Structure formats: C-alpha cells, structure tokens
Design an enzyme around this catalytic site. Structure first.
Site, PDB file in Angstrom:
ATOM      1  N   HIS A   1      -0.373 -13.477  -0.344  1.00 34.57           N
ATOM      2  CA  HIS A   1      -1.698 -13.884   0.123  1.00 34.57           C
ATOM      3  C   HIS A   1      -1.656 -15.300   0.670  1.00 34.57           C
ATOM      4  O   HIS A   1      -2.639 -15.804   1.184  1.00 34.57           O
ATOM      5  CB  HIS A   1      -2.704 -13.738  -1.024  1.00 34.57           C
ATOM      6  CG  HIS A   1      -3.132 -12.329  -1.280  1.00 34.57           C
ATOM      7  ND1 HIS A   1      -4.201 -12.026  -2.102  1.00 34.57           N
ATOM      8  CD2 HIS A   1      -2.616 -11.141  -0.864  1.00 34.57           C
ATOM      9  CE1 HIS A   1      -4.376 -10.712  -2.108  1.00 34.57           C
ATOM     10  NE2 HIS A   1      -3.424 -10.152  -1.362  1.00 34.57           N
ATOM     11  N   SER A   2      -0.475 -15.914   0.680  1.00 41.06           N
ATOM     12  CA  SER A   2      -0.357 -17.158   1.471  1.00 41.06           C
ATOM     13  C   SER A   2      -0.260 -16.848   2.992  1.00 41.06           C
ATOM     14  O   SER A   2      -0.333 -17.723   3.804  1.00 41.06           O
ATOM     15  CB  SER A   2       0.909 -17.944   1.013  1.00 41.06           C
ATOM     16  OG  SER A   2       1.084 -19.169   1.733  1.00 41.06           O
TER      17      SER A   2
ATOM     18  N   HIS B   1       0.822  -1.196   0.000  1.00 36.94           N
ATOM     19  CA  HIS B   1       0.000   0.000   0.000  1.00 36.94           C
ATOM     20  C   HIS B   1       0.859   1.249   0.000  1.00 36.94           C
ATOM     21  O   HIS B   1       0.445   2.294  -0.512  1.00 36.94           O
ATOM     22  CB  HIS B   1      -1.110  -0.055   1.071  1.00 36.94           C
ATOM     23  CG  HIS B   1      -2.112  -1.141   0.776  1.00 36.94           C
ATOM     24  ND1 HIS B   1      -3.463  -0.890   0.664  1.00 36.94           N
ATOM     25  CD2 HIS B   1      -1.933  -2.471   0.484  1.00 36.94           C
ATOM     26  CE1 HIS B   1      -4.084  -2.025   0.339  1.00 36.94           C
ATOM     27  NE2 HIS B   1      -3.177  -3.002   0.205  1.00 36.94           N
ATOM     28  N   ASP B   2       2.046   1.166   0.601  1.00 35.65           N
ATOM     29  CA  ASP B   2       2.972   2.312   0.496  1.00 35.65           C
ATOM     30  C   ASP B   2       3.529   2.453  -0.907  1.00 35.65           C
ATOM     31  O   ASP B   2       3.443   3.538  -1.546  1.00 35.65           O
ATOM     32  CB  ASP B   2       4.097   2.199   1.562  1.00 35.65           C
ATOM     33  CG  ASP B   2       4.867   3.498   1.749  1.00 35.65           C
ATOM     34  OD1 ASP B   2       4.335   4.553   1.354  1.00 35.65           O
ATOM     35  OD2 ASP B   2       5.920   3.479   2.443  1.00 35.65           O
TER      36      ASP B   2
ATOM     37  N   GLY C   1       6.109   6.575  -4.256  1.00 34.54           N
ATOM     38  CA  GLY C   1       6.348   5.157  -4.084  1.00 34.54           C
ATOM     39  C   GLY C   1       6.577   4.711  -2.651  1.00 34.54           C
ATOM     40  O   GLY C   1       5.764   5.001  -1.771  1.00 34.54           O
TER      41      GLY C   1
ATOM     42  N   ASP D   1       3.630 -20.820   2.392  1.00 35.60           N
ATOM     43  CA  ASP D   1       3.707 -22.031   1.590  1.00 35.60           C
ATOM     44  C   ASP D   1       2.889 -21.852   0.292  1.00 35.60           C
ATOM     45  O   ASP D   1       2.349 -20.759   0.003  1.00 35.60           O
ATOM     46  CB  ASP D   1       3.128 -23.229   2.418  1.00 35.60           C
ATOM     47  CG  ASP D   1       1.684 -22.980   2.878  1.00 35.60           C
ATOM     48  OD1 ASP D   1       1.043 -21.947   2.463  1.00 35.60           O
ATOM     49  OD2 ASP D   1       1.163 -23.761   3.700  1.00 35.60           O
TER      50      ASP D   1
ATOM     51  N   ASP E   1      -5.681 -18.503   2.489  1.00 33.53           N
ATOM     52  CA  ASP E   1      -5.382 -19.950   2.357  1.00 33.53           C
ATOM     53  C   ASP E   1      -5.563 -20.649   3.692  1.00 33.53           C
ATOM     54  O   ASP E   1      -5.858 -19.949   4.710  1.00 33.53           O
ATOM     55  CB  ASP E   1      -4.035 -20.281   1.627  1.00 33.53           C
ATOM     56  CG  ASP E   1      -2.763 -20.125   2.476  1.00 33.53           C
ATOM     57  OD1 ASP E   1      -2.781 -19.839   3.680  1.00 33.53           O
ATOM     58  OD2 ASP E   1      -1.670 -20.329   1.870  1.00 33.53           O
TER      59      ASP E   1
HETATM   60  C1  HEM Z   1      -2.600  -7.388  -7.061  1.00 31.18           C
HETATM   61  C2  HEM Z   1      -3.627  -6.685  -6.481  1.00 31.18           C
HETATM   62  C3  HEM Z   1      -4.091  -6.933  -5.032  1.00 31.18           C
HETATM   63  C4  HEM Z   1      -5.367  -6.936  -4.579  1.00 31.18           C
HETATM   64  C5  HEM Z   1      -6.694  -6.630  -5.389  1.00 31.18           C
HETATM   65  C6  HEM Z   1      -5.322  -7.238  -3.178  1.00 31.18           C
HETATM   66  C7  HEM Z   1      -6.418  -7.310  -2.329  1.00 31.18           C
HETATM   67  C8  HEM Z   1      -6.349  -7.524  -0.964  1.00 31.18           C
HETATM   68  C9  HEM Z   1      -7.519  -7.470  -0.080  1.00 31.18           C
HETATM   69  C10 HEM Z   1      -8.972  -7.073  -0.484  1.00 31.18           C
HETATM   70  C11 HEM Z   1      -7.104  -7.773   1.159  1.00 31.18           C
HETATM   71  C12 HEM Z   1      -7.953  -7.792   2.442  1.00 31.18           C
HETATM   72  C13 HEM Z   1      -8.003  -6.308   2.953  1.00 31.18           C
HETATM   73  C14 HEM Z   1      -8.970  -6.343   4.115  1.00 31.18           C
HETATM   74  O1  HEM Z   1     -10.214  -6.282   3.905  1.00 31.18           O
HETATM   75  O2  HEM Z   1      -8.499  -6.518   5.246  1.00 31.18           O
HETATM   76  C15 HEM Z   1      -5.689  -8.101   1.107  1.00 31.18           C
HETATM   77  C16 HEM Z   1      -4.914  -8.494   2.190  1.00 31.18           C
HETATM   78  C17 HEM Z   1      -3.526  -8.641   2.138  1.00 31.18           C
HETATM   79  N1  HEM Z   1      -2.714  -8.358   1.069  1.00 31.18           N
HETATM   80 FE1  HEM Z   1      -3.359  -8.088  -0.914  1.00 31.18          FE
HETATM   81  N2  HEM Z   1      -4.004  -7.482  -2.817  1.00 31.18           N
HETATM   82  C18 HEM Z   1      -3.206  -7.213  -3.907  1.00 31.18           C
HETATM   83  C19 HEM Z   1      -1.804  -7.293  -3.939  1.00 31.18           C
HETATM   84  C20 HEM Z   1      -0.999  -7.448  -2.815  1.00 31.18           C
HETATM   85  C21 HEM Z   1       0.437  -7.306  -2.745  1.00 31.18           C
HETATM   86  C22 HEM Z   1       1.222  -6.875  -4.008  1.00 31.18           C
HETATM   87  C23 HEM Z   1       0.865  -7.614  -1.505  1.00 31.18           C
HETATM   88  C24 HEM Z   1       2.285  -7.548  -0.834  1.00 31.18           C
HETATM   89  C25 HEM Z   1       3.287  -7.998  -1.566  1.00 31.18           C
HETATM   90  C26 HEM Z   1      -0.305  -7.941  -0.772  1.00 31.18           C
HETATM   91  C27 HEM Z   1      -0.342  -8.330   0.550  1.00 31.18           C
HETATM   92  C28 HEM Z   1      -1.389  -8.623   1.369  1.00 31.18           C
HETATM   93  C29 HEM Z   1      -1.308  -9.199   2.716  1.00 31.18           C
HETATM   94  C30 HEM Z   1      -0.019  -9.725   3.444  1.00 31.18           C
HETATM   95  C31 HEM Z   1      -2.714  -9.200   3.208  1.00 31.18           C
HETATM   96  C32 HEM Z   1      -3.276  -9.693   4.564  1.00 31.18           C
HETATM   97  C33 HEM Z   1      -3.295  -8.482   5.546  1.00 31.18           C
HETATM   98  C34 HEM Z   1      -3.802  -8.983   6.880  1.00 31.18           C
HETATM   99  O3  HEM Z   1      -4.046 -10.206   6.944  1.00 31.18           O
HETATM  100  O4  HEM Z   1      -3.957  -8.174   7.877  1.00 31.18           O
HETATM  101  N3  HEM Z   1      -1.366  -7.886  -1.610  1.00 31.18           N
HETATM  102  N4  HEM Z   1      -5.280  -7.981  -0.204  1.00 31.18           N
HETATM  103 CA   LIG Z   2      -0.171 -20.146   3.643  1.00 28.99          CA
HETATM  104 CA   LIG Z   3       3.797   5.815  -0.626  1.00 30.31          CA
END
Ligand code: HEM
Ligand SMILES: [Ca+2]
Ligand SMILES: [Ca+2]
Ligand SMILES: [Cl-]
Ligand code: NA
Length: 338
Positions: A176-177, A48-49, A67, A201, A194
């Site tokens: 998202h793992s 997000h940053d 960025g 994993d 997951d």
């Molecule tokens: C490619 C487009 C992406 C979409 C549409 C997306 C979407 C989302 C959504 C909707 C959530 C849940 C937010 C919430 O309601 O709490 C989420 C969680 C998360 N995202 Fe993504 N994401 C994307 C890419 C990324 C990237 C690039 C990363 C880091 C490299 C990332 C890391 C994470 C992590 C670690 C969580 C879990 C946060 C938590 O469990 O507190 N995502 N993502």
């Molecule tokens: Ca996992």
């Molecule tokens: Ca930023």
C-alpha cells in the site's frame, strides 16, 4: 547462464520466453515501465489471485480455492463479482489478452505482471518469479478476499488461513506504499494510500500512524480519516497499524526501507506459490527488471505540518519512535493517480 540474445541472460533457458512478455507489458500495459495505475493493479492482482485458498476448507474436506492459479483471470466473470473484487474487471479484461498472446498460463502471468510492476517503482523490490503454473484452474470460492471494513481479527484470521502470520501481513501491506483506491469512493478515484504512490518507500507506514484529521472521500465503504488532503486511509490499515499483534512490526518499518523491501520480497515469494508445488516450477527471477536508479530514503519523514506529537504510538512491548525528520514546505494535497 545461457543467453536469450541481445545481451540478455538467464540461468534457465526456458525463461528466455518471458522476455517477449516483459517487453510487451512494459511498453503496452505499463506505459513504458512506469509505476502508475496498471503496475499498482498488477501488484494488487497477485494477492486477489492467491488469497482464493483456505487451509480450513481443506481440513473440512471442501475446495478452498487453488491459490496463485490464475483463476481471477480464467474465471474473471465469477471472481470480479465478489464484493471486495468490485471493478477488478477493468484489470482482468486488460491483462487477459497479454497472457493469451504469449501462450503463458494465467497463473504465471498474474505473478509475472505484479513482479514487473513493483520493479518499476523507485525503491522497489525484485520479486522472485517462478514459472510453470498450470493453465487449468477452477474458480475461487466466494468470501475469501479481505474487505477494508473487516476488523483486524477477521483479516488476521483470513490471512493465517492462507499461511501468513500477522507479522507477514504487515510485510505484505508494504504494497500500500504504491497504491490508490478507485471503487471505495469513485468520487475521489486515484486517491493514494501514501504521499508517494510511485515510490516503494516507508511513507505508508509513517502516514498511516498519524492521527486522522480529515476525510478525502465521503467516509463510506471503509474510509476513515487520513492525515493529509488527497490521501485516503482504509479502516483495515488503521486497525492493523494499531492492533497489539501487528503494531510493533508496523512501527519497525518506518525507519528501515531496505528491511521493508527484503521482508516484502520474502512474503511475496510465499504468496506467489500458494496452492502450487515449488519443485514443479522453474526459477525465472532474472527476467525481472531492476528498479529505476533512484535514492529512496531509508528513514521515512513526517509530512509537512506534522510533528512527532501527531504519530500514534501503538506498539507497547517494542519501544518509542525516533524523531523522524519533517518534510519541508507547506501542507500540500496528495495528487491522485489518474
Ligand atoms: C490485508 C488485507 C487488505 C485489505 C483490506 C486491502 C484493501 C485494499 C483496498 C480497499 C484497496 C482499494 C481497492 C479499490 O477501491 O480500488 C486496495 C488497493 C491495493 N492493494 Fe490492498 N488490501 C489488503 C491487502 C493487500 C495485499 C496483501 C496486497 C499485495 C501484496 C495489496 C495490494 C494492493 C495494491 C498494490 C493496491 C492499489 C491498486 C491500485 O492502485 O490500482 N493489498 N487494497
Ligand atoms: Ca509510497
Ligand atoms: Ca486464484
Ligand atoms: Cl515457462
Ligand atoms: Na527471496
């Protein structure tokens, strides 16, 4: 190498300053070095940053965002009101005091915290960590964060606009793992993407390719059917796992955990310096902890009650899946990360 005291060593002496930050956050933000909600949020925050950046804006003579610059913390009041950033103010208000307490820039803190967080997860990566980002930033423009309701076209375009190919997008989504949703449907807050959100994993890659069979939440806000009770599936992950541009890389990760780690480290090295000049930074990678001693499977498993017939095959030019093993026992609800 030089020493920082107590048997801790670094290549670059200036990096010793990050050990007191390490000790504080592992104890007081990550609950004693865990890979749970705060660690997951730290990984999510790096993206997000960094995503507040636009090559197209720059080409049009407009400010596209600085960025990976700490702007999500410096200007949390602004950025946490962006729609895809809803609820991130719990995280930014939690994190800010740690950066301030240690006199490190917000921009470095965000990347340091995500590196440390990911390194707490079994199987996890050890991200490169360069330090030195200015503490002076400007707010991201609005409209730059992908949304889970966005099409694969729109997400891949947005990602190419910060420097990533569709292959790299799949690599970044290894995150998202270790991940859950809290705001898409608060009714099922903590429902992970997951079956193993504390383990870095390949289960996210396997399970996202299964046919959806049930909703965990109310099916709003970008939720689509997932394949296990308690597991939440995003429309965006569904679209990217099956789009012709990305599907073969998605499939190629299901039986190679190590490549998923290596590819994630590679792309996160790029993500962490978006809007930055690497030659102005100092390498402090050796401050990042090793992950728990834990043997994570190199090849993912079908969840209980599933067979190879449940796996959507969306890669065409590549080739078929191997019979992945099936996990023993009954179907069980995936527990939430609470
Ligand atoms: C490619 C487009 C992406 C979409 C549409 C997306 C979407 C989302 C959504 C909707 C959530 C849940 C937010 C919430 O309601 O709490 C989420 C969680 C998360 N995202 Fe993504 N994401 C994307 C890419 C990324 C990237 C690039 C990363 C880091 C490299 C990332 C890391 C994470 C992590 C670690 C969580 C879990 C946060 C938590 O469990 O507190 N995502 N993502
Ligand atoms: Ca996992
Ligand atoms: Ca930023
Ligand atoms: Cl420094
Ligand atoms: Na590297």
């Amino acid at each position: 190498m030089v020493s920082c005291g107590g048997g801790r060593s670094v290549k670059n002496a200036a990096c010793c300053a990050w050990f007191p930050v390490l000790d504080d956050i592992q104890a007081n933000l990550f609950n004693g070095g865990k890979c749970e909600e705060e660690a997951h949020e730290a990984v999510r925050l790096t993206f997000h940053d960094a995503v507040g950046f636009s090559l197209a804006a720059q080409k049009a003579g407009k400010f596209g965002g600085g960025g990976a610059d700490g702007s999500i913390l410096a200007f949390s009041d602004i950025e946490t009101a962006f729609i895809p950033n809803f609820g991130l103010e719990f995280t930014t208000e939690g994190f800010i005091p740690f950066a301030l307490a240690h006199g490190v820039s917000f921009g470095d803190f965000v990347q340091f915290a995500g590196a440390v967080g990911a390194a707490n997860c079994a199987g996890g990566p050890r991200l490169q960590f360069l330090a030195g980002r200015s503490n002076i930033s400007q707010p991201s423009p609005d409209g730059l964060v992908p949304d889970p309701t966005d099409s694969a076209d729109k997400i891949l375009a947005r990602m190419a606009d910060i420097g990533f190919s569709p292959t790299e997008v799949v690599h970044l989504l290894a995150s998202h793992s270790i991940a859950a949703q809290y705001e898409v449907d608060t009714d099922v807050a903590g429902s992970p993407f997951d079956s193993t959100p504390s383990v870095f994993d390949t289960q996210f890659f396997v399970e996202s390719l299964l046919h959806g069979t049930q909703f965990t939440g109310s099916g709003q806000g970008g939720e689509v059917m997932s394949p296990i009770p308690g597991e939440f599936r995003l429309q965006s992950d569904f679209a990217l796992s099956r789009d012709p541009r990305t599907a073969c890389e998605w499939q190629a990760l299901v039986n190679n955990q190590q490549a998923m780690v290596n590819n994630f480290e590679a792309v996160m090295s790029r993500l962490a310096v978006i809007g930055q000049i690497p030659s102005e930074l100092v390498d402090c990678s050796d401050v990042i902890p090793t992950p728990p001693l834990a043997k994570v499977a190199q090849v993912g498993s079908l969840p209980p009650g599933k067979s190879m017939a449940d796996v959507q095959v969306a890669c065409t030019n590549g080739m078929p899946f191997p019979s992945l093993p099936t996990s023993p026992g009954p179907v069980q609800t995936v527990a939430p990360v609470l």
